[PDB]
Amino acid sequence: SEVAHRFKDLGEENFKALVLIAFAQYLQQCPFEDHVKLVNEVTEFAKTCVADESAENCDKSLHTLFGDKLCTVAADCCAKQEPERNECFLQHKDDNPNLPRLVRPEVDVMCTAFHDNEETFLKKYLYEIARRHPYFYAPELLFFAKRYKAAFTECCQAADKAACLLPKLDELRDEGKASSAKQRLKCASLQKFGERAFKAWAVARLSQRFPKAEFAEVSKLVTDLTKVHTECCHGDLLECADDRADLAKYICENQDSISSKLKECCEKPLLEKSHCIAEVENDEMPADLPSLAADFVESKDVCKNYAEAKDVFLGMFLYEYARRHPDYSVVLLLRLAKTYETTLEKCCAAADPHECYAKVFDEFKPLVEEPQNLIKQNCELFEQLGEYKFQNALLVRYTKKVPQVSTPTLVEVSRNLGKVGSKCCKHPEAKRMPCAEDYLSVVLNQLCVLHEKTPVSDRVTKCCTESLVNRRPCFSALEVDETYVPKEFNAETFTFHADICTLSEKERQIKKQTALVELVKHKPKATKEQLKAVMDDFAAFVEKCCKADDKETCFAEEGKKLVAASQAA
């Protein structure tokens, strides 16, 4: 029995949690009650299997059971069987589910709901997150859950809860979105580029983090970590959680051989231990390390070793270059590794290989300076405009690049892209690139998966599928879509009402930003000069109309003077 197996390993509390997340991630539209019911029904059945490991259908695989339980409340997917049936659901997960924005009642109500029924109050949190983020890294979601419980348990019994809770919840909201983003990239890689791509990223990233570890050790870690994520992303949540625990034990047992910063981590609860390890800082770089050129460019055995085991050889190249360059982004290292390989492929077919591949590091110089200059420039620009204006500059740039993309998606993506300025520019040159470019990777991955749902821009498709590691330079190289046909104005699109006034300070900018997007789609060729000059106007429309007697019509009157002056510029 597979169900009994995992039940013992995870226990009842986690098992029930993981199954709920799984159901919430497959059927995101179904209500909380229905999942709660199915979970229990499933959970009890599991209990009968622990005892009689051959009772009803305890022999069946997880998918079969999970599939049959969901198929009692859904249709074509359920018509299929075992493999095809499961893949069916996986292809139907919605990255942008049409769910009602989530608003949180007053502090008083929450605490009451939490104190009254604790188990319910948390199952709903899980439920509401899992259905909105169908790819959220399950094991890590149980971590946020406990952290969420700790929030209420502490803040509901204080002087001013509003002051104690609201903040901690905001910190959880953001970090949860960050987490969801990083994981979405990991699944995309596995699913759209194959495990080989994922492994390389893991080699380089892990080699940067565990510099003292041996290639064979990293290789072992990478292999396991790969299976973990391969399972989570494919919906095998139980086994993913299982395998992720094992990996944590292993890393802790073998600390000394891996890293010296894993101490603090291994001295705490499971969920905290896993989370800790996955975010540990890079270990100090080993003192006396030979020069790379030695075994990789000067040696005369290059081509031969390359021939014998291309995979291990290139893997070793990556590990060696990555370990001594924590100042490089994972994508740069991988670009370097691709340059190296391409060079051996052509050079090892020449008369005198050595001569041909003797100056490979001169090919590296350009690749290393591009990111640096890009980052140096844009942070200077950021330092000058602030986050709001920078986001605007980004909205103008990205809409001109890929005008077909939906306004909701461009707004979302550009705002996030702007946050990279705030998150990374503060760091010194040394840690700027990892920060900047790996973050850009995450954010452009969102653009790519949202877009894939309804493709409308071949330029996006090409930049998203051509190469995982070159996505950023691909997009950065785009200027303005010269074949794009300007849109024709729509009264409704530029009609600002008083309902703006009730909206938060942010929900406003978001409105003004959405208008800037629409404007640029109408006037691609427009200039950053005119754009500004028009934005400030909109600012005026808001302050007036919003504070001028009983006027829900000023929105039509003040808005008329708006579009009028708008159609002029």
Place of tokens 């109500």: 109
DSSP state of 494: G
DSSP 163-225: HHHHHHHHHHHHHHHHHHHHHHHHHHIIIII-HHHHHHHHHHHHHHH-TTS-HHHHHHHHHHH
To the nearest 10°, the Cα dihedral for 123, 126, 127, 133? 180
Residues 6+ apart with CB under 8 A from 463: 471, 474, 475, 478
Place of tokens 């809409």: 399
CA distances 85 to 37, 64, 78, 229, 230, Å, are: 22, 9, 6, 21, 19
The 3-state DSSP class for residue 201 equals helix
- Is 220 annotated as ligand-binding? no
Using CA atoms, how far apart are residues 382 and 457, in angstroms rounded to an integer? 28
Closest CA to 22 of 231, 169, 182, 191: 231
Assigned token pair, 221: 């870690």
Contact 366, 335 (CB under 8 A): no
In single-letter form, the type of residue at position 383 comes to E
- Is 288 annotated as ligand-binding? no
Assigned token pair, 138: 């399950």
Using CA atoms, how far apart are residues 137 and 271, in angstroms rounded to an integer? 13
Place of tokens 């001028």: 548
Q: Max CA-CA distance within the chain?
A: 86
Contact 139, 241 (CB under 8 A): yes
- Is 231 annotated as ligand-binding? yes
Using CA atoms, how far apart are residues 288 and 324, in angstroms rounded to an integer? 11
The 3-state DSSP class for residue 362 equals helix
Residues, the chain, total?
A: 569
Of the CA atoms within 13 Å of residue 196, those in its CB half-sphere come to 4
CB atoms within 10 A of CB 325: 20
CB atoms within 10 A of CB 523: 15
In single-letter form, the type of residue at position 150 comes to A
Phi, psi of 175 (to 5 degrees): -55, -25
- Is 236 annotated as ligand-binding? yes
Phi, psi of 207 (to 5 degrees): -70, -30
Of the CA atoms within 13 Å of residue 166, those in its CB half-sphere come to 8
Using CA atoms, how far apart are residues 185 and 557, in angstroms rounded to an integer? 47
- Is 63 annotated as ligand-binding? yes
- Is 2 annotated as ligand-binding? yes
Extract the annotated binding site for (4Z,15Z)-bilirubin IXalpha.
227
List binding-site positions: 2, 9, 63, 227, 231, 234, 236, 239, 242, 246
Binding site per annotation, positions for Ca(2+): 2, 9, 231, 236, 239, 242, 246
Annotated binding-site ranges for Zn(2+): 63, 234, 236
